Design a protein around this ligand. Structure first.
Ligand SMILES: Cc1[nH]c2ccc(Cl)cc2c1CCN
Ligand SMILES: Cc1[nH]c2ccc(Cl)cc2c1CCN
Ligand SMILES: Cc1[nH]c2ccc(Cl)cc2c1CCN
Ligand SMILES: [Ca+2]
Ligand SMILES: [Ca+2]
Ligand SMILES: [Ca+2]
Ligand SMILES: [Ca+2]
Ligand SMILES: [Ca+2]
Ligand SMILES: [Ca+2]
Lengths: 214, 214
C-alpha cells in the first residue's frame, strides 16, 4: 500500500540548525549496484538555487535555509537515480514541497487615517464607513492572516462613552447610540485596531475620523 | 523510486471547514477486486476517537477536526485494505501524522511578582535574579515558543533610569551602573516583559522587585 502523492509539508521560518533532513529517497533498484541520488528543479538548480539539496549516497533530501511562504509557497523538484556510469536507472520522481504558513506578518491598515461621515439623526445600527487592514499570511487554511477589528477608544467621550461600534470581521463602523448632534460634537476620532489570528495575534492601530453632518 | 517513510505533516489549529483530505491511500492490487479501506489506531478507532477517517472506497485520509499540537503532537495509525470478498490484501500500512506548531500560546511568567536583592556596592555586570516565562508552543523547530525578555521601565528612576539590564534570552537581571545606596533608594520595581517569536510575537508583563541591602 502507498500514497498516490506524498508531498512534503514544511513550515516556513523554521528555527533550528540547517541543513535539515526532510525525507529520504530510495530506488528499489538499489539491491543491485550502489546508486547515486541528485535533485533538479527551481529551488535546486534553477533559481532560487540551493534551497534544497540531496546527499549523493544517502538520498536524504535537505532543506538548506528557512523558507518564506509569502516568497514561494510550493516547490516542484525532481529526484534522480543513477549508477556509477552516471546512467539513470528509473524515471525521475516528482517532489512537491508545500510551505505551510506561520504568523510572520503583522496586520496593516490600508490607510493611517480613514475618513467618514454620517447624518446626526440616523437610527442606531446605521453603517458609517468601512475600514480595511491586510495580512500577508494565509487566511484560507489558517488564522494567521485573519484580521479581527475593534475600536480602542473614542474622542471626545461626549455624549456617551461609546457612540460607534465596528464589525469584528468586516471593519464596518456603525452607530450604536442615540444622541449625535453636529452642534454639540461635529467630529469623532476613533482609534481602531486590527489583530491577526482572528484576535489572538499581533495588532496595529489606526484612526477613523467621523464627521457629524446636519 | 519512493520515500523511505512518508509522514503527513499537518499544521495544528487549521481553519476552513471539515473534514479535509490529507493524502490518499492506494493498494497495489487494485484490479484484483474492489478494495475497501479503513484506518485504526489512537485518533481513529481508539481515543481520541474520530479525529481521522478514511473514505472506504476512495482511500482518502480525512482530518475531521482541528488538531492541537500541545495536546497530541504525533499520531500513529494503520491503513487496511480489504477486498469486497473479505480478504486482507496487504499488510496494514503504517500512517504517521506529525502535528506542526502554530503560535497558539502567549508566554506566561512563572510568578506575577519576582523578588530579589543585591548589595549596594556590587560591580556593574553583577547578577541580581532570574525571572522566567514559559510558552507552551514549540521552541526546538519554530520560534513560536522562543521567549525574549526585556525591561519595560524602572521605578523609582532615582540614580539613573537604566539601573539594570535583563538578558534577552536567559532572563537574568543584572545591575549595570554603580551608584546603588540602600539609604537613598532601598527598593526598585522593574516592569519586566516576555515576548514570544523571539521578540516578534505576543508579550506578557510581570514585575520584579529588587531590594537593595546594606
Ligand atoms: C500555511 C499553509 N499553506 C497551505 C497550502 C496547502 C496546504 Cl495542503 C496546506 C497549507 C497550510 C497549512 C494548513 N493549515
Ligand atoms: C500579547 C500582545 N500581542 C501584541 C501585538 C502587538 C502589540 Cl503592539 C502588542 C501586543 C501584545 C500586548 C503588549 N502588552
Ligand atoms: C516544523 C516542524 N515541526 C516538527 C516536529 C517534529 C518533527 Cl519530526 C519535525 C518537525 C518540523 C519540520 C522540520 N523541517
Ligand atoms: Ca525562500
Ligand atoms: Ca499575520
Ligand atoms: Ca506567513
Ligand atoms: Ca486534538
Ligand atoms: Ca507562543
Ligand atoms: Ca502551538
Amino acid at each position: 500500500m502507498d500514497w498516490v502523492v506524498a508531498p512534503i509539508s514544511v513550515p516556513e521560518n523554521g528555527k533550528g540548525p540547517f541543513p535539515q533532513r526532510l525525507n529520504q529517497l530510495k530506488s528499489n533498484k538499489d539491491r543491485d549496484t550502489k546508486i547515486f541520488y541528485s535533485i533538479t528543479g527551481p529551488g535546486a538548480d534553477s533559481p532560487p538555487e540551493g534551497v534544497f539539496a540531496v546527499e549523493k549516497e544517502t538520498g536524504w533530501l535537505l532543506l538548506n535555509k528557512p523558507l518564506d511562504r509569502e516568497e514561494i509557497a510550493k516547490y516542484e523538484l525532481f529526484g534522480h537515480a543513477v549508477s556509477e556510469n552516471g546512467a539513470s536507472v528509473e524515471d525521475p520522481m516528482n517532489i512537491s514541497i508545500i510551505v505551510t504558513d506561520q504568523n510572520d506578518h503583522k496586520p496593516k491598515f490600508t490607510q493611517d487615517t480613514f475618513r467618514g461621515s454620517v447624518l446626526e439623526g440616523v437610527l442606531p445600527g446605521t453603517s458609517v464607513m468601512q475600514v480595511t487592514a491586510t495580512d500577508e499570511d494565509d487566511a484560507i487554511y489558517t488564522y494567521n492572516g485573519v484580521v479581527a477589528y475593534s475600536i480602542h477608544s473614542q474622542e471626545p467621550k461626549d455624549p456617551h462613552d461609546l457612540m460607534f461600534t465596528i464589525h469584528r470581521s468586516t471593519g464596518t463602523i456603525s452607530v450604536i447610540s442615540s444622541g449625535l448632534d453636529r452642534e454639540k460634537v461635529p467630529e469623532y476620532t476613533l482609534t481602531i485596531q486590527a489583530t491577526d489570528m482572528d484576535g489572538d495575534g499581533s495588532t496595529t492601530t489606526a484612526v477613523a475620523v467621523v464627521e457629524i453632518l446636519d
